[PDB]
Amino acid sequence: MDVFLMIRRHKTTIFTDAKESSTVFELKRIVEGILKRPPDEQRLYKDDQLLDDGKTLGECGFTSQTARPQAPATVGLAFRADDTFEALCIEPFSSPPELPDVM
Amino acid sequence: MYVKLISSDGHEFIVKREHALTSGTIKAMLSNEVNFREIPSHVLSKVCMYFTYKVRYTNSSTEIPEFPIAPEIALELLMAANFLDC
Amino acid sequence: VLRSVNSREPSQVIFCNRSPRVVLPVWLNFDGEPQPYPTLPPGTGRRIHSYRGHLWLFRDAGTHDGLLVNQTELFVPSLNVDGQPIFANITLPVYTLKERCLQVVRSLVKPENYRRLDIVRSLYEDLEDHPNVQKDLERLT
């Protein structure tokens, strides 16, 4: 089964898909292609929990019911800067204006 | 391969080239980064979720789910969709 | 122009509403006039008695948004084979992001207040060009 994700670090958002049976490490490989950083320098998160390389995305709670095309699940990304890992940061999206009176 | 769509407030959205190539306006803008000076990120994130949605359900006899749009982002999403014709 | 054929040959049909919308069945009568039939709630089905060569289309009962039947716009009952009903699957189309946005905005703004919206003038008419069975009928015709 395909799971539909937003991989997010700082002000960067990747939209991609993966198989539920895919592993966390394979998703770090996917990120490596796009953002050009090796898995050794990446940490992937669910909310605040670091994900172990060997577990499948389903074991980490990314499922077809959860990670859907129109509502994808979020995976946090943190990078290693020469031997030290940064703290997990995800810049929020912009805030919507207040609803017009006409609504 | 991927392309990068940048919102007005500087968030960089990285999507698959074929997903972004669904829009002809984005196709024109590309011919590997596009900057949208009028579309904030809460709007552009939904734009990319629509790309995922459209490519997934376009040719399927499986029941198609609704594309959800919160009331607060409706007007801005509409303007962006009118500009991009999508 | 777009009319049902008076075959008088009965066809048994199941309308299955596989959409989240209240579905309005519309039969195109022998003169081409759309005729509404009792609405179908989301996730429900109804056994229908129709005829071969008849024309049906389907809409959202509240908004008249267009819907798909068997991945197309028009459902024409066919010959029942092995005495099994013909299944008419009503589903949501993949609307454009523009159409979907017009739908939600129409639902949040009364039409007299469309002009109070701070948008391009092109969109004012798109909001007022609400989907209509007769407009859609002319297009296919």
**CATH code: domain of residue A67:** 3.10.20.90
Q: Which residues of chain A neighbour C117 with C-beta distances below 8 Å?
A: 100, 102
Place of tokens 């609803």: A99
Q: Which residues of chain C neighbour A102 with C-beta distances below 8 Å?
A: 109, 113, 116-117
Question: Is there a contact between C35 and C4 (Cβ–Cβ < 8 Å)?
Answer: no
Domains of chain B: 2-84 (3.30.710.10)
d(CA A38, CA A33) in angstroms, rounded, equals 9
d(CA C43, CA C32) in angstroms, rounded, equals 29
Nearest to C71 by CA among C84, C52, C87, C55: C87
d(CA A2, CA A19) in angstroms, rounded, equals 4
Place of tokens 């407030």: B9
CATH superfamily, with its number, for domain C10-91: von Hippel-Lindau disease tumour suppressor,  beta domain (2.60.40.780)
- Surface-to-core class of residue B31, CB atoms within 10 Å of its CB (0-12 exposed, 13-18 middle, 19+ buried): exposed
C108 at interface of A, judged by CB pairs closer than 8 A: yes
Asked if B56 and A69 come within 8 Å (Cβ–Cβ), the reply is yes
User: Cα separations (Å) of C102 from A40, B77, C106?
Assistant: 47, 10, 6
d(CA C42, CA C17) in angstroms, rounded, equals 6
Nearest to C133 by CA among C45, C40, C37: C37
Q: Which residues of C14-42 are buried (b: 16+ CB within 10 A; e: fewer)?
A: ebbbbbebbbbbbbbeeeeebeebebbee
Coil/strand/helix, residue C109: coil
A103 at interface of C, judged by CB pairs closer than 8 A: yes
d(CA A11, CA C39) in angstroms, rounded, equals 47
- Experimentally, how was this structure solved? X-ray
Comma-separated ranges of CATH 1.10.750.10 domains in chain C: 97-130
Domain count, chain A: 1
- What do you get for the CA distance between the two ends of chain A, in Å? 39
The reported resolution of this PDB entry, expressed in Å, is 2.7
Q: Please give the CATH number for the structural domain made up of C97-130.
A: 1.10.750.10
Neighbours of A44 (CB within 10 A): 24
Comma-separated ranges of CATH 2.60.40.780 domains in chain C: 10-91
d(CA C111, CA C115) in angstroms, rounded, equals 8
| B62 Cβ neighbours under 8 A, 6+ residues apart | none
Domain of residue A60, residue span: 2-103
| Token digits of residue C11 | 């066809």
Question: Is there a contact between A24 and A75 (Cβ–Cβ < 8 Å)?
Answer: no
Q: Which subunits sit against C, judged by 3+ Cβ pairs under 8 A?
A: A, B
| C26 Cβ neighbours under 8 A, 6+ residues apart | C34, C35, C36, C37, C56, C57, C58, C59, C133
